[PDB]
């Protein structure tokens, strides 16, 4: 008989049998970060279709942000990019009430954080190719694509540096974020869920420098042959009219995250 | 308030709020398939360290197979490569008693099947770049790497076609495989499991043609800087002595798999 | 004690890590799949891209996806390409022949790109090229640069090509006069150090083939999206696609006499 | 055929898709990070790869990782390279100068490979090259071909370079005589159509710099692993690493006079 048994005060991910690590309440994710952060106004009714019962949509707004993380401690010095898509919500739990960003989808260009995000915290991470920013100052751009098929373009024209009070306001702000997810695991060979729970991951970045500017984005609808596992996600978000881009900032700094600060909410 | 609610007779993966598909007990995976399948003899006691209690290791053997899937239905005609690493076991359950292959690890070069396999069936799938076969007949080879760092080389020299009665035997062996996995989902912000169960995925392929030959493989140890999320997996594998490659075949065909036929075993 | 080339030898940069003895019978041998389309466009517009010395035989652009495997000279490797050409007659001072003038070839691997350019003046450049995506009877590929789609190709197979039809198609493919222009710029000055037209007789042996309904679409790019190629893409995109005039999907192999390429004049 | 080249334009294949007006002050501008090592080796072995006409000044191989970002001629794109060179003296019939004889450059984007080779005889070839992996004080990269590792570089920063040391460094990096060999083969015959040495005066403006402990490791490849390049890699691997003589990590920018390159003889 097999000799593998999990240890009591350890944490794991599949494959568990190759071992894991001692639980530490003060486990950290540390990394350098750049973010291009946009908000756009859309149609409330249409966006509500994508927000689960239990949450209230606080504003007819979608938040879309490119982030690039470098010198990542838990990846022993590697890097990755992500596109975050969220909506501002209030959670009306039976135990917890709080405001945050309901995560719609996150694209990332590396699998390891995808697995971790989904399995540990119910963040709806999926893969895409995500260019680092192309820069002809004052212009910044990225492109996101699935197997050669473009589906999101972002552009930003920096118009000025944020300093003084306004930078304090910006900093103080970014420092605290309530990221909300939904960890769902399906039944095996049957409809429905084996596990289904909402999750809060408190995070924040320490902004060092910031610019304001003119932001834009564009979705390109995809066919199943183009993006078989994601076409309907893309096409759903593309259906949300971009009425106006209301916010656009480019920030540079670091993050120090208490990964064990995540918790189930209900 | 949000308008999204799951449908009763539907299956989902995160993000659930972008919808799913109606359950069909006869949901199929169909694809063309090439497999380069090796087995090697090793040390029993070392291999037993990675087999969960409840399983009995039936031989001191590791099975390692390159597979290439094309014309994949659920990926709307897409493709991907993998490396399957398993050992022969008997599950000694309180309810189920059966023999199959305990999946130690699977590398794939595409995220979609990695998420599905982990979340739907507990197959411990992770990411690596995997070369298509390089072919200078009778020599065939692949190389498996992580962010530029080689960790697995596989080589095969074809020495003969398998025909007639012996081809009939091989087809049989391949038609029915009991793939065994472990679906584990960690608690949020605490040690241990929220979900922990063993799973069976009955599968197998329809072999059309087969060649026998001389197989070899070589593991290359990785540092945490090279493969931060996987080094210990690679290195555990590397530590299992390759006393002799005992089996080496190269098969082509197709697969027709009953996806909803996977089941939890206990 | 130093490096000197051998008289016997063929080289590519870097020459000093050595080369190989010339063989007039050096081959390229590979398995091959092709999705071959042609479309009718506007003569005047196309001629803008054809060098003086060539006559455009027809208002036609040939666009073909090829996938080469078990490639001998790549010791068993593979790559994909998109070939774009037009039918021409070369009115040389010595050479007089019909061929396919190469507008551009995208490849997804650098080695054939450097070889093609430097040995034979084939205008090879890089892009990401998907393998065929296949849900029969539908086939598709997407070509992109750093995440930016610029070509989509689609093909719906309507039937197998056989008998005399297959003989004809085999003939079409077996012998192809591929025409290039090998141009090397002067260093630190306008103009050319080397400028010559090249013929590379090649093709493929077709084994099996399907006919069907073909389509292609170009997506114009900006400089920030494809800084070295936007103007190529946008030129090709400017050629109206009036009619798709041939669409075939073929499988076989190729046996190419590499040293059969010659300068034409 | 309506395409004709313009007199005072510069081109690269495909010429027929246009080019650019010559500008003697054409610039390459970019941000640059370089991890620059040198090692001592055996003179007699290194000399085998150095062409006649050049004298090997010291038995030294320079290996540097560079990352370029915000590049003008790539409209804000980026790429990585590994530069491998040896210090030489050119005993020309006309030109007499010292510089670095470029042995091979690996780059992870095809556009600069094409330009470098065809414009200046710099022996660029493709590899996958990781951006630096960083767990301070440790920095690393890995370089590979189709998944097959062939070069690992490591660096442990031990301090800042300041004052006089920094001025020395700035001066070392600012003015570099990069040397190449532009070679283009005969079509279908052995030998050269074009064979000339080339000087590209370049160099970067170092803002900040760290000193530390550097290492490197080559891994030999087989032809199935690396068909186009294995002999280059294996040649380099064969050069013993007797001592790492310099190791620095710098951070700055470059402003290069692209049109300042010239044939030397
Ligand atoms: Cl995915
Ligand atoms: Cl891009
Ligand atoms: Cl190359
Ligand atoms: Cl100059
Ligand atoms: Na923590
Ligand atoms: Na396929
Ligand atoms: Na995927
Ligand atoms: Na690499
Ligand atoms: Na890799
Ligand atoms: Na072999
Ligand atoms: Na691309
Ligand atoms: Na030949
Ligand atoms: Na390129
Ligand atoms: Na190589
Ligand atoms: Na690989
Ligand atoms: Na690979």
Instruction: Look at B150 and D146 and tell me if their CB atoms are within 8 Å.
Output: no
Method: X-ray
Contact status of D165 with chain B (Cβ, < 8 Å):
no
The DSSP bridge partners found for residue D37 are D63, D247
Judge: D123–C13 Cβ closer than 8 Å, yes or no. Answer: yes
- Which positions in chain B touch D133 (Cβ < 8 Å)? 225
Give the torsion through C-alpha atoms of A148, A154, A158, A161, to 10 deg: -110
DSSP of chain D: --B---TTEE--SSGGG--EE--TT-EEEEEEEEEEEEEE--HHHHGGGSBTTEEE-SSEEEEEEEEEEEETTTTTEEEEEEEEEEEEEEE-SS-EEEEEEEEEEEESSHHHHHHHHHHH---EEE-EEPPPEEETTEEEEEEEETTEEEEEEEEEEEEE--HHHHHHHHHHHHSEEEEEEEEEEPSSSSSEEEEEEEEEEE--EEEEEEEEEEEEEE----TTT-TTTHHHHHHHHTS---EEEEEEEEEEEEEEEGGG-EEE-
Cβ-Cβ contacts under 8 Å for B27 (sequence gap 6 or more): B258, B259, B260
DSSP letter for each residue of B40-88: EE--HHHHHTTSBTTEEE-SSEEEEEEEEEEEEGGGTTEEEEEEEEEEE
What does the angle CA D156 – CA D160 – CA D164 come to, to the nearest 5 degrees? 135
Of D47, D223, D235, the CB nearest to C17: D235
Q: Where are the alpha helices (DSSP H) in chain C?
A: 43-47, 110-120, 163-174, 230-237
C29: β partners: C255
Farthest CA pair distance, chain C: 65
Given A120, A191, A232, which is nearest B9 (Cβ)?
A191
Q: Which of C32, C99, C5, C30 is nearest to C252 (CA)?
A: C32
How many C-beta atoms surround the C-beta of residue D191 within 10 A?
A: 16
Cβ-Cβ contacts under 8 Å for C122 (sequence gap 6 or more): C102, C105, C116, C178, C180, C198, C200, D13
Question: Domain spans of chain D?
Answer: 1-265
Chain B residues touching residue D128 (CB < 8 angstroms): 148
| Segment (H or E) for A238 | helix A231-238
Q: Are the C-beta atoms of residues B207 and B170 closer than 8 Å to each other?
A: yes
For residues B69-105, one letter each, b for 16 or more C-beta atoms within 10 angstroms of the residue's C-beta and e for the rest, the string is bbbbebbbbbbbbbbbbbbbbbbeeeeeeeebbbbbb
Measured over all CA atoms, what is the biggest interatomic distance in chain A, rounded to whole angstroms? 67
Determine contact: B145 vs chain D, CB below 8 A: yes
Instruction: Give me the resolution in angstroms, 1 decimal.
Output: 1.6
User: How many angstroms separate the Cα of D218 from the Cα of each of B105, D148, D152, D236?
Assistant: 30, 11, 7, 8
User: What CA–CA distances, in Å, run from B137 to A210, B7, B134, B253, C75?
Assistant: 58, 53, 9, 19, 10
Residues of D in contact with C73 (CB under 8 A): 227
Which class for A167: exposed (0-12), middle (13-18), buried (19 or more C-beta within 10 A)? middle
Tell me which chain B residues have a C-beta less than 8 angstroms from the C-beta of D143: 148
Contact B134 C72 (CB under 8 A): no
- Name chain C contacts of A134, Cβ cutoff 8 Å: 224
Give the alpha-carbon dihedral of B13, B14, B15, B16, to 10 degrees.
Answer: 50
Map residue A138 onto helix, strand or coil: coil
Nearest to B220 by CA among B233, B209, B204, B207: B233
Question: For residue A128, how far is its CA from the centre of ligand 1 (angstroms)?
Answer: 7
Q: What is the dihedral of CA B142, B144, B150, B155, to 10 degrees?
A: -30
Q: What are phi and psi of A165, to 5 degrees?
A: -55, -35
Nearest ligand (C-alpha, residue A27): 5
Decide if domain C1-265 falls under CATH 2.40.400.10: yes
* Cis previous bond, B218, omega within 30: no
Q: By CB neighbour count within 10 A (0-12 exposed, 13-18 middle, 19+ buried), where does C172 fall? A: middle
Cross-strand partners of C257: C27
Any idea of the CA torsion for D124, C126, C265, D263, to the nearest 10 degrees? -30
D111 and chain A: CB distance < 8 Å anywhere?
no
DSSP lists the bridge partners of residue D84 as D63, D104
Among the listed residues D164, D193, D197, D163, the one whose alpha carbon sits nearest the alpha carbon of residue D180: D197
Tokens representing A169 are 């306001």
Q: What b/e readout covers A81-112, taking b as 16+ CB neighbours within 10 angstroms?
A: bbbbbbbbbbbeeeeeeeebbbbbbbbbbbbb
Which chain A residues in 13-42 lie under 8 Å from chain B, judged by CB atoms? 13-19, 23
Cα A97 to Cα A63, A261, A265, B211, C245, distances in angstroms: 21, 17, 9, 63, 64
List CB contacts (< 8 A) between C69 and chain B: 135
Q: What contacts 24+ positions apart, CB below 8 Å, involve C166-171?
A: C166/C206, C166/C209, C169/C206, C169/C209, C169/C248, C169/C250, C170/C205, C170/C206
Query: Within the 169-208 window of chain B, which residues sit less than 8 Å (CB to CB) from chain A?
Result: 182-186, 188-195, 199
CB contact under 8 A, D146 and B143: yes
Which other chains touch chain C, taking contact as 3+ CB pairs less than 8 Å apart? A, B, D
State whether the Cα torsion B74-B80-B81-B83 is positive or negative: negative
Distance, in Å, from the CA atom of A79 to the CA atom of A183, rounded to the nearest integer, reads 25
Ligand nearest to the CA of D76: 2
Q: Could you tell me the distance, in angstroms and rounded to a whole number, from the CA of residue D66 to the centre of ligand 8?
A: 14
Query: D147, D155, D230: which to substitute to probe chain B, counting the most B Cβ within 10 Å?
Result: D147
Q: Please, how many CA atoms are within 13 Å of residue B72, restricted to the half-sphere of its CB? A: 21
Other C-beta atoms lying within 10 Å of the C-beta of residue C43: 12
Contact between chains at D224 and B136 (C-beta distance less than 8 A)? yes
Interface residue A218 vs chain C (CB under 8 A)? no
Half-sphere exposure of B245 (CA within 13 A, CB side): 19
C-alpha gyration radius of chain D: 19
Give D-chain residues touching B143 at CB under 8 angstroms. 146-148, 225
* Beta strands at A205-219 and A28-41: parallel, antiparallel or unpaired: unpaired
Which of the residues B148, B150, B221, B225 would you substitute to probe the D interface, choosing the one with the greatest number of D C-beta atoms within 10 Å?
B148
Start-to-end CA distance of chain A, whole Å, equals: 41
Q: Is the domain B1-266 a CATH 2.40.400.10 member?
A: yes
Q: What Cα–Cα distance (Å) separates residue C119 from each residue in A173, C24, C82?
A: 60, 14, 19
């Amino acid at each position: 008989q097999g000799m593998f048994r999990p240890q009591d005060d350890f944490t794991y991910l599949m494959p568990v049998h190759f071992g894991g690590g001692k639980f530490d309440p003060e486990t950290l994710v540390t990394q350098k970060a750049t973010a291009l952060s946009l908000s756009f106004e859309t149609e409330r009714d249409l966006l509500e279709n994508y927000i689960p019962e239990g949450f209230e949509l606080l504003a007819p707004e979608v938040q879309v942000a490119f982030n690039k993380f470098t010198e990542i401690n838990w990846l022993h010095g590697g890097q990755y990019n992500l596109i975050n898509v969220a909506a501002p919500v209030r959670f009306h739990g039976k135990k917890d009430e709080l405001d945050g960003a309901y995560t719609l989808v996150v694209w990332e260009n590396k699998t390891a954080p995808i697995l971790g995000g989904r399995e540990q915290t119910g963040i709806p991470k999926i893969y895409a190719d995500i260019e680092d920013l192309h820069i002809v100052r004052p212009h910044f751009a990225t492109t996101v694509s699935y197997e050669g098929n473009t589906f999101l373009n972002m552009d930003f024209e920096a118009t000025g540096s944020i300093t003084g009070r306004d930078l304090d306001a910006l900093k103080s702000q970014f420092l605290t974020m309530n990221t909300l997810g939904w960890r769902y695991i399906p039944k095996v060979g049957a409809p429905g869920a084996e596990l289904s729970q909402f999750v809060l991951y408190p995070q924040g970045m320490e902004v060092e420098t910031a610019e304001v500017g003119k932001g834009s984005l564009k979705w390109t609808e995809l066919t199943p042959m183009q993006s078989p596992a994601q076409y309907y996600i893309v096409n759903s978000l593309a259906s949300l009219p971009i009425k106006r881009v209301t916010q656009a900032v480019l920030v540079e700094g670091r993050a120090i995250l208490r990964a064990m600060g995540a918790r189930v909410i209900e």
